[PDB]
Ligand SMILES: Cc1cc2nc3c(=O)[nH]c(=O)nc-3n(C[C@H](O)[C@H](O)[C@H](O)CO)c2cc1C
């Protein structure tokens with residue numbers, strides 16, 4: 001970790017620990033994609049491309065020696081910067097419990113949006129295809145609370161006709177869930193009725209999408225490949241403040257498209 | 266504990282024990298604030314002030330030597346007195362099971378109101394700010410039983426956007442709770458429906474406030490600092506009665522304002 | 531001592547030692563107050579206030595619960611800065627014995643005046659009262675060498691009438707002492723004659739005051755309270771020079787006013 005020049009910054013260990021503890025808390029709750037996909041362990045700060053497993057033929061027809069080239073996926077690297085104030089940071093040694101750290105939090109939120117955008121909608125220049133692009137896995141639904149229960153029962157049959165098993169999960173918007181909750185009138189609780197038709201599943205509410213989808217959790221269908229995880233480092237100094245940055249390197253892919261169903265309201 | 270001149274009073278050990286056992290029972294139920302805040306252990310009868318961690322600059326612009334003063338919070342001390350009757354107290358040795366002790370109980374109640382007043386509404390002359398003064402954490406609500414369930418679901422999203430976690434608690438008035446209970450008609454029980462949306466929380470009913478609020482219980486956001494806990498002592502004697510008093514020393518503060526939400530009906 | 535960022539400055543250990551050795555010498559001779567008062571050991575960089583031991587009552591007359599606030603003294607913190615030159619400092623490694631360090635010495639003198647000012651004349655905004663403010667302990671004197679000897683004998687009787695004992699000390703100006711020395715003509719030496727009437731005492735000559743005073747040295751009447759002692763640290767760098775500072779935190783008080791007498795010429 002020597003490429004992050006952390007020992008040339010005028011701070012103490014307590015101040016570094018205070019800065020490190022606050023970002024982990026927000027990253028733990030605002031990264032929504034990492035709750036139902038797989039992660040492949042880090043490879044290092046020198047990894048560059050990931051193989052696909054094919055050949056493209058570039059020679060002509062009547063030649064004696066024939067040749068081609070192999071194919072892969074490139075990785076993405078990012079960086080974002082911010083500033084902090086030294087006299088304000090210096091009261092932690094006199095014994096203040098609460099210190100102002102708002103710019104750090106704002107930058108963390110804007111970084112956390114960037115990865116979910118790629119996981120859900122893909123990147124054109126890199127050659128990545130997202131979860132909402134497979135438009136041969138669609139099912140119509142309605143707005144009454146019983147249409148949802150009918151649609152879940154219909155979807156499990158399509159899952160079983162292909163040989164797919166395992167625990168199942170539902171991912172849905174938030175305003176639609178609130179409307180469903182308000183529609184019912186003092187009946188049996190709706191969350192238990194929903195979890196009975198998934199044979200003991202879960203529910204996840206998010207602001208990233210606009211409709212609902214259903215997935216299976218046996219393992220090995222969506223992969224996120226990491227080279228280096230999220231890290232903080234030091235840049236320079238300007239007369240009363242310091243400048244720091246955040247960085248990461250990754251890519252993503254989908255293997256079996258048969259473990260996914262989309263609902264259209 | 267020698268500053269309470271308890272060995273110069275004309276009483277026996279049984280009589281002291283009878284007096285001590287009755288006040289603990291009422292203090293255990295009538296102190297409502299101590300159910301969801303933290304307590305920092307006692308420091309002694311000589312503690313005077315608590316540091317804040319800043320400096321205020323009082324010198325001029327072009328001087329060579331510059332100076333200022335440090336800042337802190339002072340503690341509060343209280344005292345309250347009452348009288349008791351000797352011939353009536355003397356039947357405990359002949360073997361009476363029930364003795365009249367009404368003035369003690371009345372004084373205990375009036376002392377217990379005083380601390381909750383400060384915790385919920387602050388003290389101007391000492392420099393304390395209470396829980397109901399942070400008016401940038403407000404949410405509108407309604408009067409039907411489903412508006413409450415909608416508002417809880419809305420509040421948990423605001424909690425998650427800041428990185429705050431942990432078990433959650435609801436604090437509400439008593440007449441409003443009774444009205445909510447009477448509105449429903451033989452449906453599924455309402456207490457279980459409420460505790461399902463808090464993901465397994467609790468409910469606290471009190472007469473000290475007028476509306477509702479929601480808090481988180483991970484630990485370390487509201488602090489009560491004690492020098493000496495509640496104690497009883499002896500003053501003098503007037504020809505058929507004795508005079509006694511109750512005393513304490515404390516202060517209070519709020520650290521993280523992001524773990525609190527107020528509801529407006 | 532990590533709050534003084536001393537390991538981020540471009541200097542070597544020999545240069546730090548040369549800088550540290552020169553300030554101690556001047557502080558040892560120019561701090562006049564520390565020769566006859568007591569010192570209470572350091573408490574740390576987080577100490578903020580010192581207790582007095584009283585209560586101020588703020589409630590009304592007919593209330594049932596009465597209350598007040600405790601009282602203390604705040605501490606004073608100071609800081610002063612200066613600059614030094616790198617090429618000039620670099621000849622110490624080639625082997626030069628004498629290096630130019632004049633600004634350091636000038637700043638040290640101006641800092642040393644500041645504390646004696648407070649010890650002898652007090653600070654209004656902080657609530658400190660100095661040694662020259664107790665104007666009920668006065669005695670008239672004259673200008674001949676025998677008036678001084680009469681006044682000392684008169685003062686020891688006032689000391690004995692109150693029960694005060696111990697070795698005694700005289701603190702006097704410098705021009706007046708020179709005039710007294712010039713007045714006499716070849717008699718027995720004057721210093722021995724003065725030290726015989728103090729029963730074996732001492733004499734201290736200073737430029738801080740304008741007349742004389744007499745004190746007793748048994749112990750425990752004037753106190754100087756320290757949080758952090760005098761220290762040197764590093765700030766920044768500007769293209770051929772470096773910037774450093776000096777800091778301290780303290781307060782002062784007088785306990786027994788009966789061990790002090792002032793002489794008026
Ligand atoms: C009493 C006092 C304390 C100060 N403490 C700090 C400090 O802890 N950290 C800081 O960066 N600046 C501090 N400063 C400001 C700093 O001294 C100033 O910006 C530069 O030294 C100006 O050359 C302080 C200033 C004063 C007057």
Ligand SMILES: Cc1cc2nc3c(=O)[nH]c(=O)nc-3n(C[C@H](O)[C@H](O)[C@H](O)CO)c2cc1C
Pocket residue numbers: 351352355
């Ligand atoms: C039979 C009798 C028993 C008494 N017992 C008590 C007693 O136990 N405690 C008490 O304070 N006064 C008691 N008194 C009242 C007490 O004697 C009276 O107030 C004073 O002694 C009058 O000088 C008693 C009086 C009588 C007549």
Ligand SMILES: Cc1cc2nc3c(=O)[nH]c(=O)nc-3n(C[C@H](O)[C@H](O)[C@H](O)CO)c2cc1C
Pocket residue numbers: 616617620
């Ligand atoms: C022969 C020579 C020796 C020097 N030695 C030093 C030195 O020991 N320390 C220093 O700060 N500058 C020194 N300087 C000046 C320094 O080289 C110059 O200010 C910067 O390098 C200009 O870019 C020296 C310059 C010369 C010509």
